[PDB]
Design brief:
It contains nine helices and eleven strands. It is of the alpha/beta class and 269 residues long. The chain has one domain: Metallo-dependent phosphatases (Purple Acid Phosphatase, chain A, domain 2, 4-Layer Sandwich). Bound molecules: manganese (II) ion (2 copies). Belongs to the Ap4A hydrolase family.
Amino acid sequence: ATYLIGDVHGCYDELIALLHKVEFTPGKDTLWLTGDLVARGPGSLDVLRYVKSLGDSVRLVLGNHDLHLLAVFAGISRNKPKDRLTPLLEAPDADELLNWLRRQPLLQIDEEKKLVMAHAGITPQWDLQTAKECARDVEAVLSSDSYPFFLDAMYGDMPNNWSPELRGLGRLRFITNAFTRMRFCFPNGQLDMYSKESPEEAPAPLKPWFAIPGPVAEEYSIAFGHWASLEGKGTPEGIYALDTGCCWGGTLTCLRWEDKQYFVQPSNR
Ligand SMILES: [Mn+2]
Ligand SMILES: [Mn+2]
């Protein structure tokens, strides 16, 4: 069976309880994870150890908090006490875990399921071929020996409009924002990088990225996490918002793909 789970955020106990509820069995089942495995919850170290141990039975995409952890580890960014990353950063296997993490994809595609996953979704300004190329470019910098330079360049809120003519730092920053920070778009599809509210609370003319018809969403289902204020509700058919805010005292959500059945684990916080 195929299971998709939203942002874990170090909530290891809830993740394990949810997987026991569906009797997840590596080798018979596959788990898809929307990213943001780490930070806020207490068990980021255990989460990374477990997910890494899954090998081919897990399909991960990296989120913005996974990339922030990599930036802290590389000395690029400052550790925020509320993220609770210190046990992971100080672990004797930290290098092994984080060098594995930086090699993971930003985008997962399954053609037989017609299913696409990324942390924040797929910007309506991209077709599938462009999304694939952009993911490959950023994954290449992340998996290279020079990844701290990329991580440093990645911070920024501009440019917020895609063009195939984008080059260099701006191209990389847009790609990273689109895959890992996107929520709202302007009507032309341009990213807004400030509003984190629910769609009902947003100021006009902002609309959710999934309310703007895009070529990927017309041919594929899209699963994503990231947007906790959405509470997993209000999406069109074929759009699956899996982040129900476990680290925030909400819930951890698992979707079984074969029958679209939902399973929920309440937060222990
Ligand atoms: Mn998150
Ligand atoms: Mn996120």
